[PDB]
Every structure is written in C-alpha cells, then in structure tokens.
Design a binder for these strands. Structure first.
Lengths: 210, 116, 156, 78, 60, 97, 126
RNA sequence: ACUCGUGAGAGACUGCCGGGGUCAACUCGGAGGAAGGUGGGGAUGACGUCAAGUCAUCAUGCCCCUUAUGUCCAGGGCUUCACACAUGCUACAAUGGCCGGUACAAAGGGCUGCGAUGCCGUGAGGUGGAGCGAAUCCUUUCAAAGCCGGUCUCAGUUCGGAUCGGGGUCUGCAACUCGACCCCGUGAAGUCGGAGUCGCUAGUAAUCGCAGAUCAGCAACGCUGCGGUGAAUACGUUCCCG
C-alpha cells in the first residue's frame, strides 16, 4: 500500500551506521547465528528494562555486546546480580566470553525506538490512543532538538473490529531526502484484542556531518 | 547404386549415401569410409561395384543393418512389453516411456489430437 | 519522442567501397539482425554482380533502380465516420527512399534465386529495367493513390 | 557400471530362501534392485505403499529394478 | 517451520543427502542462502535493520 | 618480508587503519610500501521482497569487500611487536603473509 | 613521446605516435589483418583523413577489452586525441566534423522483472 | 612512462554570446568543452485505493485436536493424462548446414573447495596431484557469433532434432516409479504459421556466448547479472488505450 522502505535500511550506507560490526570469511554463518540468539536473549528482560539499541562489535572471538537503553538501574540492578546474570547467560549460550557494555541515552523521548516503546506500552495499558500518540508527541516535539515526528498506529484501535490506521505528525519529516538522520522505530502493542503496530519517525536534522 | 538393401540415390556423396541405411548415420559413415578407403566425396554415379563389394562385406560383417536392427529392436520392445514392466505399461497405453511430462506435452506419442 | 515534436536523427556515414549514403542505407536495410558484416558481404557481392551484368558503375544502376521503385504518393487508412477512407498523401524524400530500399530488399527476399547475392543482384537489375515485382508494387501503390484521389482533400 | 546395488536385507533373506530350497511369498519393501540372477523363481510381494503385489521372477527380469513390475499409479480417464 | 522439523534438520542425519539448510532465524525450508544461513525474508528484514555486517541495498 | 593484506567493509576505516599501519611502521622506521588498493569483491543477492507470491518487484542487496595492501620489507621485532599490539577499528581483518 | 587512451564501450586502446612513412602496429599484427571488415578500416583512419596526414604519421597501438568494433571506435578516439597532441590548430577541424567526442553509449543495466533491459514479458490479459 | 587497480579532487551551473520574451520566469541557435540544458542508468514509491496478497517466513487474537489434526520410519505421491490455456526454448534452412585454420571480451566463482602438465579412453570421464583461502593458482593463456578456406545445390534434404533401441560415465546408502551427461543407431512433426495479439525509440531492438546464486547430483531452455556484434523508424495527434 504505502511501499515505504525502512529508512534505517535506506540510509545504512550513508548516515546511519550498522549495528553489528566485524569481518568474517567462512565464519559468517556462525556469527549470524550467534547474533540472532543474542538478540533473542536480549529481547525479553531488556524489553522490560527499556532497551533501544543492541550493538555487537566482535573482535578476535571475544565478543563485545553493547546496549543503549533508557535506565541504567533496571539493566544494572544490584551490580553483577542483574548485569552478570544476563551477561553470564550470554557467555554460556554463545561458546564465547562476553564483555557487556551498558550505556544511557541522554534523552529517551527522542529515540524513535524508545518512543515506540512508551507509546505501545501505553497502548497495551488501555489508555486512549489519540491521547497517547498526541502525548507521544507533545513531549518529544521539543525537548532536545528534533525537527520532525510522525506516528502511525494500525490494528484494533480501541478494541474495534475495523483495523483503522492513524496518522499524526508535526514539522518536517522528509523520507526521500538521504541527508535526513531519521531515526525510525516500530514496536507492537499487545492488547487482549490483538496487536497495535506503532511506527514512529523522528527527523533530528539536516546535518550530514560527513 | 545398390548396396546392403538400400537403393542409393543418383547424386549423393558417400558419407551421406551410406547414411540412408537403417544402421548407419553420419559417424558410422565417417568411420566406415575411413576403414575401407573409399573417398567420402565420391558421388553415387561414380561408385565402383568392387567398392560395393569391399564396402558391402565390411558393413555386413562388422556391423548390423535393416533386418537385424528392426526385427531386432522390435524384439526388445516386445520383450519389455511381454514381461510386465512399467515401461511395458507405457508402451501398452501409448505414453512416453522415459517418465517425462504427460500433462501438457508428449504429443508425439499420443499422436493426432482428439479434443473433448 | 513523438507527441513532443520532431526528434533528432542519427547521421549516417557513407560507404567505404562505393561512397554513397544510399549504399550504406541499403546495407542497414539488408541487415537481418546481428550480422552487419554479412549484410555488407551481401550488398557488396550483389553490387559487383550488378557490375558484372552491367559493366558500369554499380551505384548508378542502384540509383536508377532506386529511382524506378521510388513512390510519390502513399495511401493512408484514416476513418471519417463509419467508413474507412484510403487517403493519398505526398511522400517526403526520406520516406520515399525508405519505401524504395525496403520494398527492394523485401521483394528481393521473396525472389527465388539460390543465395541472397543472386537475389539482390537480380532485383536491382530488374528494378533498373523496370521488370521486378517491386516496380509492380510502386504501380499498385500509385494505383491505390490515383484510384483514391478524391478523399485526399481533408488536407491531412 | 561398477558395484551395482544389492538390497542387503533382501540379500540376506534371499540366500536363506534358496539354501533351504524353500519358496515363500515375500512381503517386500524393496523397490530398488533385482541384483543377481539368484533371485530367479522367488515370488516377491512388491510394496507400492498400499498393498503387496505378487511378482514371479524369471530369467528376463535381470536388469530391471524390482519395484516396477508393480505400478504405483492408477489411471482410466472416464 | 514446525519445531519437530526445525529441530530435525539440526540433528545428524542417517545419510549425507538428508542434511539440508533450513534458515536459522525462522525455520523456512525453501529459499535459504548459504553465506548468511538466512532465508530471503530474514535476510531482507535483518539487512534492513543493519544487523548483518555490510550487506546493504544495491544500485549500480 | 612481512606482507600485510587487510580487508574490511568500510573504505574510511580501512584508510585510517592503513594510516595507523603506515604511521606505525614509518614511526619505528623501515622500508614500507604504501597502501595499495586491491579492488573489491561484491556479492549481489537478489531477494523476492514479498513474504509471498510476487516474483517480479525484487530488491537486491550487495556486499562490498574492500581490500587494501601494505607490503613490509626488512622486519625488526620492535616494529613487529606494534603489529600485534594495537588494532583500532576491529572491523578490519588483517592477513599476515 | 605522445601517448593517448581511447575508451569505447568496454574496450580501451593505447595508441602512441612517431613520424614515419605508413605503418600500423596492433597487438603484433597489421591493420589489414586485425580488422578484416574494411569498414572499421575507414572508422579508424577517418581522423587521419580529416587532418590529412594519412601517410605522414603513424600509430603504434596496443589495446584491451571490448569486441572488434569497440576496439575500432576506441582507436578512432585515440588517433583523434593524438592529433590534438600533435598540433592544436588541427583541433577545431577535428571537433567540427564529429570527432574528439567519445560516445557514452554503453550497454545499460538489465532490470528485474524484464527479459532484457527495456523488454517486458509479453502479457496477455484475459 | 603508458594503462589498470582504488583514494582524494576539478568538471555542467542556462555559466558565456545572439534572438524571442511584460526586460519575468523560460524557450530557438552559437561557442568553449570529454559531456549541454533533469549527459546515461540506477537506488529512492507521497496521502490513500483494491476488505488485493500472505495466520505456510515470522509474530499473533479467538476457535478447534491432545490418544491425536502431535511425532518417528519404510515405501509411494507432489513428475499421473482424452484434454484446454500460459510463459519460454529449438526449429522450418544457402544471411544456412558440416569439416579445417585463425582473432578479439566483460564480469564473476573456489576448503574437506577450484583442481593444472602428464598418462588411459572416441567421448562423457578415469588415474594423479602441480598450485592456490587466491589482481598471483584454478576456472585453460579464457569465449561464441567474426574472418579465411573447402564441401553441400534448394531437396522433407548433409534442413530439423523430437521419439525409440542398444552401449556407457558420474553423483549419491539408493538413479524402477523419477537424474544429468557421452557414444552408436533411429530420424517424427515442421515449407514462417487463421481470427487475434505482444515487445521495443539507442549501444535500444535483434542475435551471440560467459558467470553466478540455490546445489552431492540435476529437470536451468528458468532466474539474476556480464560483455560481443549491432539496426530500422518517429510525417504527426484525426483514431484505439491509460
């Protein structure tokens, strides 16, 4: 319908960096398999925690798993108790040893992934969806330094039978411009009536910064 | 000319004139005409009856022809249609034997078309 | 490139052996696809066979056959109101050279000589005298044009 | 053209069958080989998946693999 | 992509012809690649998310 | 001789990495060949971009592999130590031949 | 001396010059035995015929790539830009006739969902 | 030194001259220039449509099975065939076939992989392992159409290869149902195709080989790409289609 390519996959050569970074000849399928099982292992407890980014640098078979989140304090509970448990399970599930770096984003409401987190987690929690979005925004519109936003919500909105898509915005979000620095995040709400897939575009600025 | 049983034409080269027999194609003409010594470029009007003699004795001696090949095969096809093979079933029903496509093509085995 | 106006066309180099626009254009219309070199061998061999059967310059024989097949009027198929009207229209120079060479090649290709060289030689010769089927197609095209002269007024 | 197949389960069974000079109807799974002419005379219950078809093996069967003395498909048309 | 078949394609088969690829992320049997070990859908979604190192969208 | 052939995905990181190797061996002092571009390899993978029937309308994902070369002549172990001592970008794999 | 690179479709030629009575050295061969088509024979000597130094000046060429005709048109280009590199007042006479300008026409990319580049699969809607 | 390989940079902006322009945009010509006016091609699909597609990639709400609608294996089927459609490939020959000699590519692929000289075969291939994780070694120094020469004389043929018989090789536990390839024979329809209809505007159409992914093997004539040789025509919006 809207045949819109994932813009983090449309600027992954130009502005947005890769999330996983190594070099691999004849070891690549194994590094893919470990990358997948690591991201499944970091889905659940960190999606409780407020995860945004999961980068995996990979040096000579050590591993370096780095996570950008919005609360160092739920990811790091008691020191080593909440960190070294998921870290140690990453050390056992992989056949390797894990150096887990955990870091905070300076503003959670201007990460598109974290905006999709807070919006969809509100939308599972029986709030008004036009109020959620509309408050998804107002906040982020701001606050830093953030020249667009565009929120779309499809699915059983309000528990209705029809799957109505909604489309709210403010400012400038140019997708066809490649010097855009757009963050994109889709996260999917889980109501009892079903799943409300939320897409958030956030246009930070014109800046190439090449 | 006359040979093993195939009436040769008026004006053909020898490596094509040998081909008109059931047991001989192009490669057998290139090997028979190399073994015996007749030039392949010779026409049939210019053919010698002694060349018919040596050529004829060679290709009835060391190779098989019309009657051997035909009631020869046709004993092998009826061999596999008597014993009850699946290829025997294909030769029974008039279907392609090599297990190939039967849904649309293989019209050269079913033959002329009746349409329902 | 129609509906925007006239489109610019490629300039055509002349022949190396004979030195004419019309020889090279005959080559590019001989070109059953892929083999321009073999088209050059057909056209060149056919024009030296025309040189054999004339003893003159072959391009003069070619331009005289080209003149004797070249039409002046072509019929159209424009349809005013429920009847198909053969409309006769003045033929441009390039359109007339195109119909001359294209008819020459195609009705040489229908002719029953052994190779293509003997076909094209005999068709350039018979079109030089005026005895080919292509000259009869010029006379049938002017037959349709003169038979349909009245419909030509539309000024179209 | 080298070592042909052999159906080792049927091979063990066949040898036992011909050493005792006993002939018995055989329910055989094997559609893959009629390897030696040691199989001549033995009745093979060939299994096209669904039922077993008795097949007598004679001297002409040598060189035809065992399954398709019994066909797997059924077609009439009308 | 049933767990009996996802799990059954990872054991040691009893013959060497029986071992097939079966994309790791979802378990999709057809259209699996060898260098990634991912099917075309997991290749397209993961390569869109920048998760695969240096495969990117093509234009020559 | 110790010939270093380094491969990567980023031309920028392999150019700054080759600047680290040239500044390293040139800093310790030796005869060193500068960075030589071996050309590439591209892996082009055509993906039917539908989770179901749409055989037309593809998208095809390439894969760039950049290959830079630095040939080292006259090795001294004070220079050889700094090879295994630091590698900065670590998206580059270094073949030591 | 003077050396010139002529680039046609995927061919490339490296023709240098020296003054002498007429000689043409391709990759170990003569010009009449490397180009048996007699039309490319004009297509490469036409820059020599324009600024009429056909016999006075000779090309020592080497090449790569393309087919026959890409190397022919490339060698036209390299003769032409070499004749810039002899006398610059030959240069307005070359460029006027249609020369010094290599043809950027290359075989374009095949497109997905087509048989070739610009050829749709022939569809019969019912 | 020339290429070439890959890094950085210059270069096309109606910038410069002539005319129309309301002295506005913009358009017609000229110069310089490798290129002239979005130079060529990509990647890039707005708000929405069609309850279009997919609960079989995945995820999933609800309903159903839980002694089976789970699961394990052998054999069979997904390849059946009086038919009808659809996309392709090889053709119907002399611009051609067959034999001999000879010249030019681009891109790619390679570890329990790619595998050379040599030897055994007619040939698939066998024996053997040089050498390479590869601008190096191997895919032969790479092609085929091309050019030079000979033969064939318009014919159901030296056209055409379907089919069928015999004889093999390789892959695999296993080529029967159901693999490809080679050798010998066999040698059908087919003489340019009714109504209708499709593609394409320049390195395009047309034709010629080459590589790749999937893959032990292959139904590859498919798909994705690479290059070789290379046309005709566009008067113009009346008509058909959007």
């Amino acid at each position: 319908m809207g045949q819109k390519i994932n813009p983090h996959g449309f600027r992954l050569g130009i502005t947005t960096e890769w999330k996983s970074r190594w070099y691999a000849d004849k070891q690549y399928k194994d590094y893919v398999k470990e990358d997948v099982a690591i991201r499944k292992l970091l889905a659940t407890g960190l999606e409780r925690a407020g995860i945004a980014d999961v980068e995996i640098e990979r040096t000579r078979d050590r591993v370096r798993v780095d996570i950008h989140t919005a609360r160092p304090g739920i990811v790091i509970g008691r020191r080593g108790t909440e960190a070294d448990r998921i870290r140690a399970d990453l050390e056992k599930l992989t056949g390797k040893q894990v150096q887990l770096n955990i870091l905070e984003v300076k503003n959670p409401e201007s990460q598109a992934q974290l905006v999709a987190q807070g919006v969809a987690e509100q939308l599972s929690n029986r709030v008004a969806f036009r109020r959620a979005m509309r408050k998804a925004i107002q906040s982020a519109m701001r606050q830093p330094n953030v020249k667009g936003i565009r929120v779309q919500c499809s699915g059983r909105l309000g528990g209705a039978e029809m799957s109505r898509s909604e489309f709210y915005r403010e400012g400038r979000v140019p997708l066809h411009t490649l010097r855009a620095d757009i963050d994109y995040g889709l996260y999917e709400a889980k109501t009892t009536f079903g799943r409300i897939g939320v897409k958030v575009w956030i246009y930070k600025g014109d800046i190439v910064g090449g | 000319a006359r040979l093993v049983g195939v009436d040769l034409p008026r004006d053909k080269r020898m490596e094509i004139a040998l081909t008109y027999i059931y047991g001989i194609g192009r490669t057998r003409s290139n090997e028979i005409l190399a073994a015996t010594g007749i030039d392949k470029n010779m026409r049939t009007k210019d053919l010698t009856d002694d060349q018919v003699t040596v050529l004829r004795d060679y290709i009835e001696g060391n190779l098989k022809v019309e009657g051997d090949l035909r009631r020869e095969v046709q004993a092998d096809i009826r061999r596999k249609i008597e014993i009850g093979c699946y290829q025997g079933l294909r030769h029974r029903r008039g279907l392609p034997v090599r297990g190939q496509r039967t849904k649309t093509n293989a019209r050269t085995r079913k033959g002329p078309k009746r349409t329902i | 490139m129609p509906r925007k106006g006239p489109a610019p066309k490629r300039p055509l180099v002349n022949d190396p052996v004979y030195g004419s626009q019309l020889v090279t254009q005959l080559v590019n219309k001989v070109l059953l696809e892929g083999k321009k070199s073999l088209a050059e061998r057909i056209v060149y061999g056919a024009l030296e066979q025309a040189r054999e059967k004339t003893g003159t310059d072959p391009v003069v024989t070619l331009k005289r056959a080209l003149d004797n097949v070249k039409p002046a009027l072509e019929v159209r198929s424009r349809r005013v109101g429920g009847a198909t009207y053969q409309v006769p229209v003045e033929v441009r120079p390039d359109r007339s050279t195109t119909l001359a060479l294209r008819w020459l090649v195609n009705f040489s290709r229908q002719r029953r000589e052994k190779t293509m060289v003997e076909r094209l030689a005999n068709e350039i010769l018979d079109a030089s005298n005026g005895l080919g089927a292509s000259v009869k197609r010029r006379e049938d095209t002017h037959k349709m044009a003169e038979a349909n002269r009245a419909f030509a007024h539309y000024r179209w | 053209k080298k070592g042909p197949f052999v159906d080792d389960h049927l091979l063990k069974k066949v040898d036992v069958q011909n050493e005792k000079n006993t002939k018995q109807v055989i329910k055989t799974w094997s559609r893959r080989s009629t390897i030696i002419p040691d199989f001549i005379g033995h009745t093979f219950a060939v299994h096209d998946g669904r039922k077993h078809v008795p097949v007598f093996v004679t001297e002409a069967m040598v060189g035809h693999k065992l399954g398709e003395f019994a066909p797997t498909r059924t077609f009439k048309g009308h | 992509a049933k767990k009996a078949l996802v799990h059954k394609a990872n054991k040691k088969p009893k013959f060497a012809v029986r071992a097939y690829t079966r994309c790791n992320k979802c378990g999709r049997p057809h259209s699996v690649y060898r260098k990634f070990g991912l099917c075309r859908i997991c290749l397209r979604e993961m390569a869109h998310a920048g998760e695969l190192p240096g495969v990117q969208k093509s234009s020559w | 001789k110790i010939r270093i052939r380094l491969k990567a995905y980023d031309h920028e990181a392999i150019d700054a990495s080759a600047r680290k190797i040239v500044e390293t061996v040139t800093r310790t002092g030796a005869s060193v060949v500068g960075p030589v571009p071996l050309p590439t390899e591209k892996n082009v993978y055509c993906v039917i971009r539908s989770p179901h029937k749409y055989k037309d309308s593809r998208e095809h994902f390439e894969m760039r592999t950049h290959k830079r070369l630095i040939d080292i002549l006259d090795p001294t172990p004070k220079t050889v130590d700094a090879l295994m001592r630091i590698d900065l970008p670590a998206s580059v794999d270094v073949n030591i031949q | 001396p003077i050396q010139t690179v002529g680039r046609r479709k995927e061919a490339v030629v490296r023709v240098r010059l020296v003054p002498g009575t007429g000689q043409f050295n391709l990759d170990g061969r003569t010009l009449e035995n490397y180009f048996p088509n007699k039309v490319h024979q004009q297509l490469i000597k036409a820059p020599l015929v324009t600024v009429d130094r056909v016999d006075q000046f000779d090309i020592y060429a080497h090449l790569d790539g393309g087919g026959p005709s890409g190397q022919a048109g490339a060698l036209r280009l390299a003769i032409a830009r070499a004749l810039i590199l002899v006398q610059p007042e030959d240069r307005p006479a070359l460029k006027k006739a249609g020369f010094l300008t290599r043809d950027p026409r290359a075989i374009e990319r095949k497109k997905y969902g087509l048989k070739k580049a610009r050829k749709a699969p022939q569809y019969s809607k019912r």
